[PDB]
Design a protein around this nucleic acid. Structure first.
Length: 137
DNA sequence: CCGACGACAGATAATTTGTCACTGTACAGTAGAATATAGATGCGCATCTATATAGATGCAAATTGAGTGGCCTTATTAAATGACTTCTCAACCAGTCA
């Protein structure tokens, strides 16, 4: 019913005729996944742009959503001996500048800061340790 | 009785609008154009590959012609046919007769 192509822009331009032929001949949905560059490649061919015109867009975290997420990370990923309470305002500002809303940097910052806290025997993250980690980016 | 504040009315420059006279300034051939870069696309030429072999060779039956080896009644007589060998192949004188 479906075929998912990650990093679609690694495809050579001619291969898209095989991708469109698959999608049209059979009852298979094809999903192309990628960055803004993908669209720069796709716009170089009407035939393809039109067979894949519909799209969904991922965005960045902000406001309450970024705030609520940092707790989900602390509870579902970090699971430390006692709570760092990283949704608190000063810890949110340090994370906001460090992460700019990308879940990736929030994932990498919080895994590194938790590993750095635990290997120093700290039961929780604190202001200076998180700034020592954030300064490396 | 004296002093201070509000109602009502009256006069007045600030504000806005309009009109009028004197004036600085653009009209004077001219900014679309030159000069780099990245990035994608297409045509050409070389540099491999994988398939496709038919010719040559080795070998193994399939007779095939040409060999070689092993097994078998005999002695007399007679006739017939066909052959071989041997031998022989004088000539005139002396005694009767019609």
């Amino acid at each position: 019913e479906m075929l998912i192509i990650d990093e679609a822009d690694r495809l050579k331009p001619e291969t898209f005729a095989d991708v469109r032929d698959i999608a049209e001949d059979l009852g298979i949905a094809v999903v192309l996944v990628g960055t803004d560059r993908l669209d720069a490649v796709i716009k170089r061919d009407e035939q393809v742009l039109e067979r894949f015109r519909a799209h969904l867009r991922f965005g960045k975290l902000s406001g309450e959503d970024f705030k609520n997420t940092v707790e989900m990370w602390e509870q579902m990923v970090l699971k430390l001996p006692v709570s760092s309470n990283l949704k608190s305002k000063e810890m949110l500002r340090i994370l906001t500048s460090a992460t700019e809303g990308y879940i990736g940097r929030l994932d990498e910052i919080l895994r590194e800061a938790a590993i750095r806290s635990l290997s120093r025997g700290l039961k929780k993250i604190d202001k200076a340790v998180l700034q020592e980690v954030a300064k490396e980016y």
